[PDB]
DNA sequence: AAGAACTCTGTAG
DNA sequence: AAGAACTCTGTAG
DNA sequence: CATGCTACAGAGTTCTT
DNA sequence: CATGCTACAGAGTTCTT
């Protein structure tokens, strides 16, 4: 807070304010405020004031409870959670508000300390959309007529900055759509430079000032609408499942003459805002948090796994966490943060019973925490070190199935691929529990036995379930179980109703009276346990003290409780045909239940109801994938056979052919196609990186002789072309081979399939037997 | 701080503490003391508990004064900044202690919360000797009876651990001296893995449970000696002259009965400590904290410059300041830490009128701090950009240069250079003031027009001033004069017996009453002028009120004063010859001293009197660089003739010599050979790679033929012959004028330091009429 | 009038 | 017997 | 160099009435 | 994602004492 000089004076509802979600936006308008010259319209630090939003505000229509109405006004009630707030009650002392006047008249708009606020995010996809949504949402929600008479306004910054050389005026756009449209129009991206502004201090200092000149415009006042007040409720409210059903649409782009009206005269509706920023903000938070059905995992942790697989290619060394995310954030993109991105590596890195990841993308080396404190007790990232699981990752995310996935594009450049599809569904294998904008996403882990007789079923036919479980496909039968995993838990899984349950085993020495616990539900990590068994009141009548001798990779807790008590938890507690009267005591049962809301390849939520539909809808995607695989080695191989052939054929042609005395490359180029010899890139053969099957032919049709060329000379010896044919023959026993496996009955790549199960299974096993530290 | 169950009790003498450094070591500590069961030793947090220093104390020698000691005894009066320190206060807090009483008999000890402390430090060669150092000298200077008894233990981690395949017992070797001992006296480096642990935290947890398993080992308590006293009186507190007859001499190892006598048994004298480990940290940090005067700049700064000349080398492209100093502690082994490394390279590349780099060596995009606030108003270092200047890089530290540095090897790795000594002294541009332990590092700008005479007159014999100059060489007459620099500086300086003296401008408008200010002394921060003005209580009645309109890269102060006071300034400020009653009023002048305390390339502090013998130490440094640089590039050149003049005859031979009908490498050599050719390594020739003369003709000697195999087919055409052919006629002529170059009359490479002279100004005046931002 | 406190600057923790 | 109350994860400001 | 309030959703105890 | 006490020397400008 840096008070203006005429704040909460005569002269104050003349002021303005600035609202700044972050400290970036604090450093530009630092800058802007001290400029000072040449700025008459532009002001200084009087008149302006400051105040940070501390990042992500919180809404009070969750908050508030709108109690005791009955008595013919509605009164509401702020919660105790939201009094307390620190930015919430400083942006109140600020301003000078109170909550219980409605400022219909000119009086009370000028008992606050400033004349309009004037907020001030960034233009990236939250922000404006997020902090202005819940912000201009809680200013509706307790004073709408501040929002009415012009009260709050929006300070919109450019996104992206278009130069032509020799002029100085930019093009301003605002939005990614607007921009792809007036690159559309635009005959060539000739003469003029981009700049894409992800961020407030991203301006540089002509720029602020620039911008700052203009100070005056580029501010547009908010208006609300009769229709404003439905959308506030959908958009935050208490009911999700109203803006669930509004979810599952899609963003509506804002008409031109919508366009038009704001730019013309700044009087943005709230109505507009919210459908158009919020909910893009909304659907970019559901496909960053809900995981993809085909990955089983977060496109932040995909992004992570594709800089690990670029990062550990070269070498498998050893490799520090911040460094790693540095890494991943440089060559991956990541415009967010990055102790998130820390924070997520780190999650993925851990490896413990009962860790959400139960088969993890990376070895860890460091303390990442045991079960006791579940992953909180992980160190800094600086000195934690991870490296690449080689051969899990190896045989689970194939590279010659990671060419052919589809990618995200970043500004036009190559990004992670927008889903790894795997052999075998990690949406099934792992768990978590995630909350997003609308929807929440738990999974419970399969063991490793049904699944594997089920892909096993659906893709060898020697198994005799195969056509029953084809039939399963087309009837919905699903008649193999799938049943929750027993790895690192001695306990038992129960099934009652439509509900399963784990139960923690016990060991009683009434002679001794003491409760000795041994295995516990997999996921509350034993130390909440015992302080939420330290929390019930009940309870407290009952034991007399807890003792935890449970180190790593093990659980052994001992109760003492009252000797007269021993019997009495039986009459109080309860035992029921499901749970005993100890498991009722100590909560060693665990209901576990499952969400299955995933995000599609497209964009959208799908839900699920069990887990035979994931994997009913996974295996079609790795059917085409390895079907595409399959015709795309194919094309390459016998584009390579062709080349490898006229490399020989040329080799034993050019003794007699003397190219040496002749001049320059056209001379020798044509030469050589009036001898027969075929052109084709063999930069775009020896490595095709992702290359599609009518773009690899529509590039291999023409090429160049640079084969001919940029074959080293030291090859001319006998033994290396005899070699050569020996590899050639290699390479059409391969043709034959693809070309057989291309024509097998069931579909395309039936026992290559089998071969990636059995190698992923055995470096599951291998990795399960030493701790996933492999070595 | 975390409570030990029965500490502070009846078994509170038989307790331990353990001192950690910070939470690295915490973090280890976490994990030891625990280790789930199996813990004869180290107790599972059982009277033991536990401390951080927070990083580096302060030390009690110079807090405390002694003073009314006449009264027959000597009572010692503690800081006021002494008592409110946290760490310091905490500790006491923590051990139950009291300054006044003196521990002679058993019970005064027994009053005490812990048995005795135990501190952890990593081993690196700060915190083992400073944090250690300074925590028990702080300890003897007020409690020595702790010290003698055995109070006072700390815990000896192995810095380097080297396993034998097979064998699960390391060497714990503890000192590089005896590492590299071990490893000269050991036949060769097979079967065996060495591993740095530069930090407590990078031990693993199989490591920590092998440490933890003979916690009642690696314990050592430290003995008073009656020489210590001594000893940490010259170390800590007293003067800088007391200990800068030793800090130039050098460390002294410990004699190996000395070792076997700490081994042994397990008492660490304090005098060994200190004349080892805390005088080692100091020659480190003199080392790292003062210029070289070569460079002008630190071993932080040299090691940033070399990162950023490996990083922006391929591409200049901008990037963040956080991915560089990533970078640069990737590549450049930079084993300090993380933003104080961001904070150098924000401080490299600032650049404003009264800044401490003259002539950065990055280009800056965003907010670096202007001249207002002396560049600590500079954004966070998440967003601001930073460049490299490609071109005054390009011809201030040449790359050819760069190849003949002696270069730092970290870990049998290569490093930033020794020394990155360039065309003209750094150490005379460049201004700045630096503490250290010991000295004190200050300079002040010379002008870039008398230095330029003076390399001139010595270089070029054109100078009429060349002998005499020579004479002043040989005479230390020093003719030519060395004034400050002029540059962004509206300001006039004088002389006065040995001192500059820097002066501001003002102007007096009597009728107005208005004292303006357009320029104030050299490097004076706008606002803490005002601040320092403002805390001066004589002069708050001789003023009304100051007011700034200074923007960037400008000045302009207007003080409002009492119209009766005008006069009276007069008065009691004197105006003296050399300063003015408005001057001395304002404090507009400011003496310029100088502290030439620079780091020898060896390693030692050498002390200058004035720039002179900054010049001439800096002249011989570059005339045997361009000598040795002429030598190696005559070799390379003559080798490289010799080599393109063989693949040129070879590929006119090779058309009747009919090699293609040959089996293998063997058959081909032997056939090279017997028609009698030269086997020279081409990968050796191509790029050398900073090979010295005597390497280079040793490796020359033998080689190989690769150049015939590895030369690429497509050279075969007649145009590229006599392109080749061009190529070598090109490099004989090189070679004629390296060679009339190495015969000249005052020294090989005397023109050309003329050329890169004209180049290095040229881009100094691009630099300045540009900002130093060139584009 | 002499002497104890109080900041500054880079490189560390 | 209903409701307010507080956690609990993985990505983000 | 560890850390600190928040969103979002859904259930499960727990306190509290 | 800003920030908080420290070392080290030396030369100052206020502070009393
Ligand atoms: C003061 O205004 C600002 C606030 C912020 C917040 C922030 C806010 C906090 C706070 C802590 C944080 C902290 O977040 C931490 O990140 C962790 C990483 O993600 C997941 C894994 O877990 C997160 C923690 O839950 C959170 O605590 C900052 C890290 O980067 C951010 O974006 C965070 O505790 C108090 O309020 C950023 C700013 O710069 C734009 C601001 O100007
Ligand atoms: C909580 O974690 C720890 C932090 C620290 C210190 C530290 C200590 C501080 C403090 C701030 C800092 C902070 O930097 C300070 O500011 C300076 C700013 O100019 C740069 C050039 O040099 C920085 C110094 O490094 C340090 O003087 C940390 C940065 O890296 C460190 O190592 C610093 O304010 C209060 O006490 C030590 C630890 O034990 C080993 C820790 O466990
Ligand atoms: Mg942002
Ligand atoms: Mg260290």
Redesign the interface.
């Known amino acids: 807070y840096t008070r203006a000089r005429n704040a909460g004076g005569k002269r104050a509802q003349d002021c303005m304010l600035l609202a700044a979600e972050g400290?970036?936006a604090l450093?530009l308008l630092?800058?802007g405020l001290?400029?000072?010259?040449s700025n008459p319209s532009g002001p200084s630090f009087d008149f302006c004031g400051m105040i940070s939003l501390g990042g992500v505000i919180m809404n009070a229509c969750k908050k508030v409870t709108n109690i005791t109405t009955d008595s013919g006004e509605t009164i509401m009630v702020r919660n105790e959670q939201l009094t307390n707030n620190k930015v919430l009650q400083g942006i109140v002392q600020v301003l000078g508000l109170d909550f219980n006047c409605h400022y219909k008249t000119q009086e009370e708009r000028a008992k606050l300390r400033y004349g309009c606020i004037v907020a001030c995010v960034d233009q990236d996809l939250d922000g404006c959309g997020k902090i202005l949504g819940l912000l201009l949402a809680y200013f509706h929600l307790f004073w709408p007529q501040l929002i009415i008479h012009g009260f709050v306004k929006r300070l919109l910054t450019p996104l992206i900055r278009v130069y032509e050389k020799g002029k100085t005026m930019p093009v301003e756009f605002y939005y990614e759509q607007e921009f792809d449209a007036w690159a559309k129009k635009q005959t060539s991206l000739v003469n003029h430079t981009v700049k894409y502004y992800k961020?407030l201090?991203?301006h540089?200092?002509h720029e602020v000032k620039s911008m700052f000149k203009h100070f005056d415009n580029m501010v547009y006042t908010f208006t609300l609408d009769d229709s404003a007040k439905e959308l506030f409720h959908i958009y935050f409210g208490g009911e999700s499942e109203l803006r669930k059903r509004e979810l599952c649409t899609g963003v509506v782009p804002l008409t031109e003459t919508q366009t038009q009206s704001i730019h013309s005269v700044r009087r943005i509706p709230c109505s507009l805002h919210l459908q158009v920023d919020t909910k893009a903000y909304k659907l970019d938070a559901i496909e960053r948090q809900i995981p993809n059905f085909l990955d089983g995992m977060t496109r932040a942790r995909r992004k992570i796994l594709a800089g690990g697989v670029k990062c550990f290619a070269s070498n498998n060394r050893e490799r520090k966490v911040?460094?790693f995310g540095?890494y991943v954030?440089?060559h991956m993109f990541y415009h967010h943060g990055?102790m998130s991105l820390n924070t997520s590596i780190i999650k993925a890195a851990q490896y413990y019973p009962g860790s959400s990841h139960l088969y993890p993308v990376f070895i860890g080396?460091?303390?990442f925490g045991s079960r006791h404190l579940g992953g909180k007790?992980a160190?800094?990232p600086?000195?934690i070190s991870v490296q690449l699981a080689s051969e899990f990752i190896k045989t689970m995310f194939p590279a010659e199935d990671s060419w052919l996935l589809p990618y995200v594009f970043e500004d036009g450049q190559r990004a992670e691929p927008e889903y790894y599809v795997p052999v075998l569904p990690l949406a099934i294998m792992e768990y978590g529990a995630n909350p997003s904008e609308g929807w929440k996403y738990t999974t419970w882990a399969r063991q490793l036995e049904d699944i594997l007789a089920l892909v096993r079923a659906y893709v060898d036919k020697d198994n005799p379930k195969h056509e029953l479980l084809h039939y399963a496909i087309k009837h919905k039968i699903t008649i193999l179980p799938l049943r929750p995993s027993n790895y690192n838990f001695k306990g038992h899984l129960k099934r009652f109703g439509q509900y399963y349950y784990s139960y923690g085993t016990y060991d009683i020495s009434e002679q001794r009276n003491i409760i000795t616990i041994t295995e516990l539900p997999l996921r509350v990590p034993t130390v909440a346990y015992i302080e939420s068994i330290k929390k019930s009141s009940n309870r407290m009548t009952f034991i007399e003290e807890i003792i935890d001798?449970?180190?790593?990779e093990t659980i052994e807790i001992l109760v003492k409780l009252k000797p007269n008590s021993l019997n009495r938890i039986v009459e109080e507690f309860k035992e029921t045909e499901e749970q005993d009267s100890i498991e009722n005591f100590l909560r060693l049962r665990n209901c576990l239940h499952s969400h299955l809301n995933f995000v599609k390849p497209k964009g959208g939520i799908i839900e699920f109801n069990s887990y035979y539909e994931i994997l009913y809808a996974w295996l079609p995607y790795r059917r085409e994938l390895y079907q595409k695989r399959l015709m795309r080695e194919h094309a390459v191989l016998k584009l390579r056979i062709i080349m490898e052939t006229a490399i020989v054929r040329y080799i034993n042609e050019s003794?007699e052919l003397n190219?040496?005395?002749?001049?320059?490359?056209k001379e020798?180029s044509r030469i050589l196609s009036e001898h027969g010899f075929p052109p084709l890139n063999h930069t775009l053969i020896i490595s095709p990186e992702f290359a599609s099957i009518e773009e690899l032919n529509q590039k291999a049709l023409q090429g160049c002789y640079t084969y001919?060329?940029?074959?080293?000379?030291?090859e001319?010896?006998?033994?290396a072309k005899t070699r050569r044919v020996e590899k050639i023959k290699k390479m059409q026993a391969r043709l034959d081979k693809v070309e057989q496996l291309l024509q097998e009955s069931p579909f395309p790549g039936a026992s290559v399939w089998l071969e990636e199960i059995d190698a992923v299974e055995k470096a599951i096993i291998k990795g399960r037997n030493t701790q996933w530290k492999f070595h």
């Open positions: 400290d970036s450093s630092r800058t001290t400029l000072g010259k961020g201090a991203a540089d200092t911040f460094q540095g954030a440089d990055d080396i460091g303390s007790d160190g800094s600086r000195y001798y449970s180190s790593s003794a190219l040496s005395h002749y001049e320059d490359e020798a001919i060329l940029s074959l080293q000379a030291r001319l010896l006998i033994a």
